[PDB]
């Protein structure tokens, strides 16, 4: 028929398939270092919270970058904080043990269904798989 401008198909998603087991294997076989903190600087409330998870320190780094980048403190916006801070810290003390989150091992989500087993390079021909190898 006709085209219709779809930001949901030229928007960077990159999160439906971001699995922590694959990302951990990539960090293992990365062959370039990882920017870890000086060891005491990443625990949070004198140990009343966790250490902090890798996603939490990534998000903290993003927030401080945006913070310094346009000179604005973030706030105590009530609905978003009563959702995200309390639910986040309660699943943090549920699943984050010693700076490592073990929540994923208790979660049904198929690895190979979404994040592996390529869909575009599906190679549904003997000739296409032969040319993809050679």
């Amino acid at each position: 028929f006709e085209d219709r401008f779809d930001a949901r198909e030229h928007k960077d998603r990159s999160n439906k398939s971001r699995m922590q087991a694959m990302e951990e294997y990539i960090r293992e076989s990365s062959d370039q270092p990882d920017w870890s903190a000086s060891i005491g600087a990443d625990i949070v409330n004198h140990g009343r919270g966790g250490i902090k998870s890798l996603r939490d320190t990534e998000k903290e780094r993003r927030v401080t970058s945006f913070e310094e980048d346009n000179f604005t403190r973030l706030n105590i916006t009530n609905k978003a904080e009563k959702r995200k801070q309390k639910q986040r810290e309660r699943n943090a003390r549920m699943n984050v043990i010693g700076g490592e989150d073990f929540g994923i091992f208790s979660s049904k989500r198929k690895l190979e269904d979404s994040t592996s087993r390529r869909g575009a390079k599906k190679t549904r021909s003997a000739w296409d798989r032969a040319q993809r190898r050679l």
Binding site: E24, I39, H46, I97, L111
Partner: protein, 171 residues
């Protein structure tokens, strides 16, 4: 956390007696919390064993699980197999907390001296003073547990009892 199945059998009572006495715990909730999340950990590793070799779930979640267990420190570097996650147990998890570790490193004379040092803030891993006893130190924070520099057992100015006794003996 969650309570066990038969919470009052005599083996469980002598178990909790030995655990709380050997690790200086305050009540049953420490054992029950760390055993609940250990139950989740090795209930997951059981399923990772019940699936087969060269399964994607088994390969990636297995080496992920044993590497973050090694980095928590309950599993040593050489046993990189997934049946040691099943051999893991509860005192392997609560030997990693900061009270146990302060006593084992010898900054305290017992686990109770370690608990009161931690709650009186004389102990800092790395940069920050940790002040709760159940902290689960990691394999990289294992060697920077030392006395806080803000504390008289470090090198700081002595506390109120020492300075008041010094002042009254100067009077």
């Amino acid at each position: 956390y969650s309570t066990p199945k038969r919470p009052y059998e005599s083996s469980r009572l002598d178990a909790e007696l030995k655990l709380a006495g050997e690790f200086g715990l305050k009540n049953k909730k420490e054992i029950y919390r760390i055993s609940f999340q250990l139950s989740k950990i090795r209930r997951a590793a059981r399923d990772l064993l019940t699936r087969d070799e060269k399964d994607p779930k088994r390969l990636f979640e297995g080496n992920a699980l044993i590497r973050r267990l090694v980095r928590v420190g309950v599993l040593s570097e050489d046993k990189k197999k997934l049946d040691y996650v099943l051999a893991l147990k509860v005192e392997d998890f609560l030997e990693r907390r900061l009270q146990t570790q302060v006593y084992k490193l010898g900054l305290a004379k017992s686990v109770h001296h370690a608990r009161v040092l931690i709650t009186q803030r004389h102990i800092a891993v790395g940069k920050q003073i940790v002040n709760i006893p159940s902290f689960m130190v990691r394999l990289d924070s294992e060697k920077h547990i030392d006395f806080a520099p803000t504390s008289p057992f470090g090198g700081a100015r002595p506390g109120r009892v020492a300075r008041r006794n010094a002042a009254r003996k100067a009077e």
